[PDB]
Amino acid sequence: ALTTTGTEQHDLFSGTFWQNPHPAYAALRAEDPVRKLALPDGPVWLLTRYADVREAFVDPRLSKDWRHRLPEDQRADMPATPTPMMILMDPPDHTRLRKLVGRSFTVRRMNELEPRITEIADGLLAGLPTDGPVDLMREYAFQIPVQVICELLGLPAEDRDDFSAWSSVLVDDSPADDKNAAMGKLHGYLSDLLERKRTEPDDALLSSLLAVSDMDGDRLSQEELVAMAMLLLIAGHETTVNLIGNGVLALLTHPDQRKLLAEDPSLISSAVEEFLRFDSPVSQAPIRFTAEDVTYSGVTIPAGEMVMLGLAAANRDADWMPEPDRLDITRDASGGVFFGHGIHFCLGAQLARLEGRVAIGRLFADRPELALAVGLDELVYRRSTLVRGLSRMPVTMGPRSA
Ligand code: HEM
């Protein structure tokens, strides 16, 4: 299996890496900042230094067009995308689709979700037991973003178990065939759902976008519409959940920071920016492809290569953040690559921040005696090149505050 080269040998994407990748990231940054990883499905490069990562995000030679893997002899007949989502596109199609959906994620709109997000969180908290076993992932961290995305999009509650299962397969280490099947089932479900919405619209986002598509199919094609729905659904199941889990865990393992939050609950938004930096939920950005040779930190990646931008790694770069391994919820936050950078910058950044401060803030306010029910070393993490996320989090809630 893979290990870091140089003075320190740490497992990479196997072994100890899943439990705590942060030492490996640091050894990469120090001694191998532009690393080719010989992974089972083919080699993938990894950039870990903050200055390289942030600039790479605005470097058009690092493209989302997967046809760059192919010799020119082979690109003509090939679709731009495995599924026409904007996160898999370059301009101009990316520009058009982002501009369109961005109109529904205005600052005013996301904030008026706060009362509802708070009811959802409060309802979940009221439903949790005082001392029997609780998996805080499945029972709280997962539930908030999923209910919110279902409500925002207009996804039937009764189908949640079906599409959450498809979503999870797509973001972890599942075989390529399993992912292809999951994507197929998700495409079909959402296509059938949109057909029903035509007949009976609602006021939620998928109906609104179906109407846009119906009125102007060059602005949004039917297939682009399904891919958009799929993207928003997956983002609603697999990101914010791990801000909540990782942020909760950070407070559970850092009594000093938990105390500062208890003493000034208004630190929560600064705290959320710090959780995003300290244990980034999207550990590596989804893959980019070199359209031509690129050079970062003295190392040239040839054209036709797959490249991950190491967000969890860059966000602990001491060249950017002093004392990057210290959790300090009081930092006046700026920069950061946890939501990406440039044209693909997280569409849901305001929504994730809101869900995060509500979920984490109300949790610690309601259950100020919350604690882990296992040792730190017994926590099991998901195997994913995309997310840093707990599989389960055994906790004891303790009594409700008075
Ligand atoms: C803490 C939670 C979240 C994190 C850490 C996160 C992270 C990211 C990152 C790093 C990117 C850029 C990927 C790249 O450039 O390759 C991105 C893009 C994106 N995110 Fe978020 N995300 C979160 C929550 C959400 C939510 C709640 C939504 C729901 C709307 C969402 C929707 C999207 C979409 C649609 C894109 C593609 C944007 C584009 O291509 O123009 N994300 N996200």
Ligand SMILES: C=C1CC[C@H](O)C/C1=C\C=C1/CCC[C@]2(C)[C@@H]([C@H](C)CCCC(C)C)CC[C@@H]12
């Ligand atoms: C089966 C296949 C077929 C071959 C593709 O190349 C890989 C694949 C699925 C992976 C995909 C396509 C669907 C959307 C995914 C899962 C993206 C996903 C929505 C990322 C979440 C973005 C997050 C940072 C907000 C990233 C990788 C994408």
Ligand SMILES: [Ca+2]
């Ligand atoms: Ca209960």
Ligand SMILES: [Ca+2]
């Ligand atoms: Ca209407």
Ligand SMILES: [Ca+2]
């Ligand atoms: Ca510096």
